[PDB]
Design a protein around this ligand. Structure first.
Ligand SMILES: [K+]
Ligand SMILES: [Mg+2]
Ligand SMILES: [Mg+2]
Ligand SMILES: [Mg+2]
Ligand SMILES: [Mg+2]
Ligand SMILES: [Mg+2]
Ligand SMILES: [Mg+2]
Ligand SMILES: [Mg+2]
Ligand SMILES: [Mg+2]
Ligand SMILES: [Mg+2]
Ligand SMILES: [Mg+2]
Ligand SMILES: [Mg+2]
Ligand SMILES: [Mg+2]
Ligand SMILES: [Mg+2]
Ligand SMILES: [Mg+2]
Ligand SMILES: [Mg+2]
Ligand SMILES: [Mg+2]
Ligand SMILES: [Mg+2]
Ligand SMILES: [Mg+2]
Ligand SMILES: [Mg+2]
Ligand SMILES: [Mg+2]
Ligand SMILES: [Mg+2]
Ligand SMILES: [Mg+2]
Ligand SMILES: [Mg+2]
Ligand SMILES: [Mg+2]
Ligand SMILES: [Mg+2]
Ligand SMILES: [Mg+2]
Ligand SMILES: [Mg+2]
Ligand SMILES: [Mg+2]
Ligand SMILES: [Mg+2]
Ligand SMILES: [Mg+2]
Ligand SMILES: [Mg+2]
Ligand SMILES: [Mg+2]
Ligand SMILES: [Mg+2]
Ligand SMILES: [Mg+2]
Ligand SMILES: [Mg+2]
Ligand SMILES: [Mg+2]
Ligand SMILES: [Mg+2]
Ligand SMILES: [Mg+2]
Ligand SMILES: [Mg+2]
Ligand SMILES: [Mg+2]
Ligand SMILES: [Mg+2]
Ligand SMILES: [Mg+2]
Ligand SMILES: [Mg+2]
Ligand SMILES: [Mg+2]
Ligand SMILES: [Mg+2]
Ligand SMILES: [Mg+2]
Ligand SMILES: [Mg+2]
Ligand SMILES: [Mg+2]
Ligand SMILES: [Mg+2]
Ligand SMILES: [Mg+2]
Ligand SMILES: [Mg+2]
Ligand SMILES: [Mg+2]
Ligand SMILES: [Mg+2]
Ligand SMILES: [Mg+2]
Ligand SMILES: [Mg+2]
Ligand SMILES: [Zn+2]
Lengths: 231, 118, 119, 122, 56
RNA sequence: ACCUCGAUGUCGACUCAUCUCAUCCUCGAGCUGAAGCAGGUUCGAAGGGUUCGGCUGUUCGCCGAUUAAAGAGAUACGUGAGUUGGGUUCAAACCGUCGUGAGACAGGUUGGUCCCUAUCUAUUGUGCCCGUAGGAAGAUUGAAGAGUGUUGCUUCUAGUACGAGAGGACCGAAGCGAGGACACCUCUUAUGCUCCAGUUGUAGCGCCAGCUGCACCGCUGGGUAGUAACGUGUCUAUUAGAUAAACGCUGAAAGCAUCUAAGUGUGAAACUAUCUCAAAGAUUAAUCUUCCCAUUUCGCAAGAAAGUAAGAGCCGUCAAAGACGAUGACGUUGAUAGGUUACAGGUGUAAGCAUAGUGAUAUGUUGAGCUGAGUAAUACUAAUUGCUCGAGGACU
RNA sequence: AGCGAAAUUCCUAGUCGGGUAAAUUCCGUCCCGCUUGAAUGGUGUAACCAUCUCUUGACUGUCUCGGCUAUAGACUCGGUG
RNA sequence: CAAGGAACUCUGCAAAUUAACCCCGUAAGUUAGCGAGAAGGGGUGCUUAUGUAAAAGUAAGCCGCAGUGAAGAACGAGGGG
């Protein structure tokens, strides 16, 4: 469908009080003006997408093939390049900011790389139960759980593919859907998004149109303090 | 393109901070007027009591107020920079800590804080 | 497994830093492991910058770190620090000490490091 | 958060000094009961001049919690003891008075009689 | 648990295929010429232009 | 009595579950001795769910309170190189009973050692080498896949349909939840062993004051960053296609009738997609963009001697990462780490002095002092002036 | 005689009462005690028990339900093996 | 280790509460010896003064969330075999 996408960097989390008496936790995203580096058409390519360039950097910090591509396309040198599917209607070499893309309070989804956690066990990874601690116990307390499917020639006799055991956790792309934009800050180029965004502070963040609610925009307005100077 | 994250968070918080934000220490008695909203109008409900803690930096500044009604002690956590909430410092008291937790263990004549502070 | 060695406890780590910093202030060079020099450097720099005013409060602060050495006592190390070493670093914006890597030990292959006062 | 087999006090005039939770009514494996939740209970400490007798299984609604809960504005309501009042099918209190303060979460889940018979709502 | 079948002399070498050693990077000192492993003080105590330790 | 007595550990419980349908709930439909509500039976359907306790070693079972429901089985009556040993079944002891006796009882009771460092394969993660036919740096399509799929209550529709009445809807809409899942630390909490403060004993700094070592971090009250839930955000929708049961419209064989044979429909949480993740070692090795190779001689050409670049690696500083590799940032043309400076947050008015008191101590300087990781600047220190690998693309 | 569903009762999770929201265990009682019983002793009994069994107050990570921190391992490097 | 406090399990196994000294108070039963440290409670720091051979204690004042401020000190009640 008509999917709109922007890229930014998560800077932290705060809260804002709103009319109708709710305290809304928000995530703050620093969104640089993104530059459309390429447009790929359905007829000529077999699919349609828009690839932008963001997180600008000086030319001496970029490799020779990438700077050659940037100077060939007459674009600002950036070290980050990525595309979003089904993004159409933007001319090559046009600066795009979230103000032109999304509305004041429309629903969007956000994709980001999760915070790395390393080699974690079965309980912390698959929400497994811990074995009993008292009334007599054994060496394996944080046991993963018996992986027996069948013992004997007439049964599996093997661990089934895709079993739930210990392994790497974190540093993986994850998407949280139906997040309402709260406010735009043009001067600081700063986007406010309700809820919590995955990833460490300072990581890359992709804001896209929500596929569950594409055109739904729920109104939200902030509260103006009525307090006055001390008497 | 250097990003001072703390500064940007501060700007978002300043958008909705209050002007006065009266001060109070740990052991202080304040009057908190809750602007409860029904279908119509507002009923200003007072929650006068004793402060126990004031933590936070900006829009996330919170404080704890302890009250006692009919011998039942109730503790309530308010946000300072929250609309429809008005704080009025009544008595300034002397304490030797920032989180006076013993107030939720000591009661009666032993729950009275001497005045004065510096 | 039980009856294990006490180990690299937090108290042991603080005492190790105290001993190395006292020695490096007394002699001027320390030949230790690289990972221990990289931890003693912080305390060395902190002691030197706090000993730049030479008031009795600063003596009380330093005395919680200094230890007795062969070449100086705990009271003559005080005179050496506040009158000889620290006055030299009067307008240097930090970085009074340098850590450089020597070769590996014959019996451990751990990376040695010399910690010195950067003139 | 009052849970299964939790002893709590009764804030009404009915002769029941200590009451024990049996089931957190409302769904399957409902772990906890927050303010305004209805539970099935058994009277364990009662008095001779009381409407209820020791051992009866009855239905109650909680009004206070030691753990407390947080409202939408950000205020965290926290009492110092878990208390419940005995209610009837119609959602009407069994006692004629309510002792101490009660929360505002009752107002959302009906319980208008409980609020009108309380000393002061919070 | 123990091997119910003996491992041949071929599986052993296949596992050891990753046990090979690597040659540490070396450089030339700028005041005496002998080879020293990179980013470390030479045998004369002369690192760059700074006299670090007394000569061996 | 076919395998196993040169050993196949046997009940129950815990953890992890998977599969089948003869379906407990949710979903669709036919008949009803189906007015409505609630039922009974049959057909289709396995996507998800299918509670906590008292007594007993118990499976089973009875009982209590809930739920939409508390399904039937299989997997060595799954699961002890995963846990336990309550039960059975060692040696000890007693009761009832049998025996003249030593002893015996699917009779009862008390007590009573559960070993193994994983070689192969299976599986969860992460790497090196090589291939993808010039090399390298980027961005993609997606063959074959994996993950989730639960449901309740209230209000309105509407006291309308139906029904003497009592009672009480189908369809549809909104709000609030329980369980499960993903992510995060603004709020509330837990932790926070080189943080702050209070404080006891003892030994030291020659003594007072002030600190240090030890006593669970000595103890106690708080607590930065980080890690987490008990916390708060989101999901657990929707739609399209082909259908099962079932219902069809038009229609003959069989002038009627008839859902079917031709043609044309409707139709379920099942199936294929829509949602999330990963994916060209997919050797069937894909596509696009950019960059670098395009020498002198000898002869032998995907030949030699030298000779030509993009890039990568070794080494160093590291943490958005992390067992180790790897991932990502930087290496003087630099803010990568430490130090310094300023600040935030935390702790709670520092030492010294002066006053007051006989003294413990209080008051003023003083929202003072201190501070591990946090925020940002600053080359002061450490990332040296180094080494290695690496290209002309056969022909059709 | 005394005691009795008992360290004894097969039928049997015997009947009834008490304890619990709910009690094959526990306490009292009833007695067709298949097969109790008087020095292989019978019935009571104050004190005592690293004895067995049941109810209960405080108490707590036993548990709902798992989470954080520090060491020694495990993991990486060098030596023996 | 927040809320709950045996819901865990064959069983409160293990862990947790109490713990030293001084001052009050202490039941049923009994072989009159016991039960009994029963149960249940309170105080503990520092300074000044009074007390003594030394104390203990007594009175006033001061500080802290907490004063055998850390170490070492009994969990209890009831019924039965
Ligand atoms: K056999
Ligand atoms: Mg063992
Ligand atoms: Mg253990
Ligand atoms: Mg076969
Ligand atoms: Mg097989
Ligand atoms: Mg210690
Ligand atoms: Mg060989
Ligand atoms: Mg090897
Ligand atoms: Mg035969
Ligand atoms: Mg066989
Ligand atoms: Mg054999
Ligand atoms: Mg065997
Ligand atoms: Mg075995
Ligand atoms: Mg069927
Ligand atoms: Mg499906
Ligand atoms: Mg019980
Ligand atoms: Mg069988
Ligand atoms: Mg079995
Ligand atoms: Mg089974
Ligand atoms: Mg059989
Ligand atoms: Mg097994
Ligand atoms: Mg087993
Ligand atoms: Mg074992
Ligand atoms: Mg086995
Ligand atoms: Mg046994
Ligand atoms: Mg045993
Ligand atoms: Mg025997
Ligand atoms: Mg005989
Ligand atoms: Mg495949
Ligand atoms: Mg915070
Ligand atoms: Mg002293
Ligand atoms: Mg017809
Ligand atoms: Mg269809
Ligand atoms: Mg081939
Ligand atoms: Mg830094
Ligand atoms: Mg002072
Ligand atoms: Mg007789
Ligand atoms: Mg009798
Ligand atoms: Mg018995
Ligand atoms: Mg009975
Ligand atoms: Mg038993
Ligand atoms: Mg009896
Ligand atoms: Mg006789
Ligand atoms: Mg006999
Ligand atoms: Mg005889
Ligand atoms: Mg007898
Ligand atoms: Mg004994
Ligand atoms: Mg070690
Ligand atoms: Mg080794
Ligand atoms: Mg707890
Ligand atoms: Mg509690
Ligand atoms: Mg139980
Ligand atoms: Mg159980
Ligand atoms: Mg014990
Ligand atoms: Mg007694
Ligand atoms: Mg008896
Ligand atoms: Zn040299």
């Amino acid at each position: 469908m008509e999917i709109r996408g922007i890229f930014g960097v998560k800077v932290g989390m705060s809260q804002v009080f709103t009319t109708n008496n709710e305290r809304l936790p928000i995530t703050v995203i620093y969104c640089e003006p993104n530059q459309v580096a390429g447009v790929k058409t359905e007829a000529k390519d077999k699919y349609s997408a828009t690839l932008l360039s963001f997180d600008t950097v000086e030319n001496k910090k970029l490799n020779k093939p990438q700077q050659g591509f940037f100077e060939k396309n007459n674009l600002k040198p950036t070290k980050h390049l990525q595309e979003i599917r089904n993004m159409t209607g933007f001319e090559m070499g046009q600066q795009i900011t979230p103000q032109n893309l999304f509305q004041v309070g429309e629903y969007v989804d956000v994709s980001a790389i999760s915070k790395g956690r390393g080699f974690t066990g079965a309980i912390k990874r698959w929400n497994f139960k811990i074995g009993p601690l008292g009334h007599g116990a054994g060496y394996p307390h944080r046991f993963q759980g018996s992986v027996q499917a069948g013992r004997g020639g007439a049964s599996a006799q093997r661990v089934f593919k895709g079993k739930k055991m210990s392994g790497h956790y974190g540093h993986e792309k994850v998407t949280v859907q139906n997040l309402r934009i709260v406010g735009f800050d043009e001067a600081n180029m700063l986007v406010l998004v309700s809820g919590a965004i995955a990833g460490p502070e300072g990581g890359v963040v992709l804001i896209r149109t929500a596929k569950k609610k594409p055109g739904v925009v729920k109104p939200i307005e902030l509260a103006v303090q009525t307090e006055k100077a001390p008497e | 393109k250097k990003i001072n994250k703390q500064a940007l968070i501060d700007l978002v918080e300043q958008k909705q901070l209050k002007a006065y934000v009266p001060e109070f220490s740990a052991g202080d008695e304040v009057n908190v007027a809750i602007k409860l909203k029904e279908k119509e109008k507002v009923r200003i409900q007072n929650f006068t009591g004793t402060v126990l803690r004031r933590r936070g930096k900006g829009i996330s500044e919170t404080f704890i107020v302890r009250k006692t009604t009919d011998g039942i002690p109730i503790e309530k956590n308010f946000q300072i920079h929250n609309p429809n909430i008005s704080i009025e410092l009544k008595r300034r008291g002397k304490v030797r800590r920032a989180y006076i937790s013993y107030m939720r263990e000591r009661s009666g004549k032993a729950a009275k804080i001497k005045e004065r502070k510096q | 497994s039980y009856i294990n060695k006490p180990g690299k406890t937090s108290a042991w780590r603080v005492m190790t830093v105290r001993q190395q910093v006292s020695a490096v202030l007394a002699y001027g060079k320390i030949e230790t492991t690289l990972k221990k020099a990289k931890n003693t450097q912080k305390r060395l720099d902190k002691l030197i910058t706090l000993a730049k005013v030479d008031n009795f409060n600063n003596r009380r602060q330093v005395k919680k770190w200094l230890l007795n050495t062969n070449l100086f006592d705990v009271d003559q190390l005080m005179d050496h620090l506040f009158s000889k070493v620290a006055p030299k670093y009067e307008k240097t914006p930090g970085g009074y000490s340098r850590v450089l890597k020597l070769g590996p030990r014959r019996g451990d292959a751990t990376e040695m490091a010399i910690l010195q006062l950067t003139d | 958060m009052v849970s299964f087999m939790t002893r709590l006090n009764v804030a009404d005039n009915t002769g029941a000094k200590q009451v024990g939770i049996i089931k957190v009514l409302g769904s399957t494996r409902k772990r906890y009961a927050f303010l305004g939740d209805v539970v099935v209970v058994s009277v364990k400490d009662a008095i001779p001049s009381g409407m209820v007798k020791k051992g009866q299984v009855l239905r109650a609604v909680i009004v206070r919690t030691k753990k407390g809960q947080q409202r939408k504005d950000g205020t965290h309501l926290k009492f110092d003891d878990n208390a419940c009042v005995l209610i009837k099918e119609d959602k009407s209190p069994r006692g004629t008075r309510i002792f101490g303060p009660v929360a505002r979460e009752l107002r959302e889940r009906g319980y208008n009689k409980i609020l009108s018979l309380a000393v002061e709502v919070v | 648990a123990v091997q119910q079948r003996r491992s041949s002399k071929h599986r052993r070498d296949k596992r050891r295929s990753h046990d090979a050693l690597t040659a540490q990077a070396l450089s030339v000192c700028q005041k005496c010429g002998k080879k020293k492993l990179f980013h470390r003080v030479c045998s004369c105590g002369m690192y760059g232009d700074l006299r670090v330790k007394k000569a061996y």
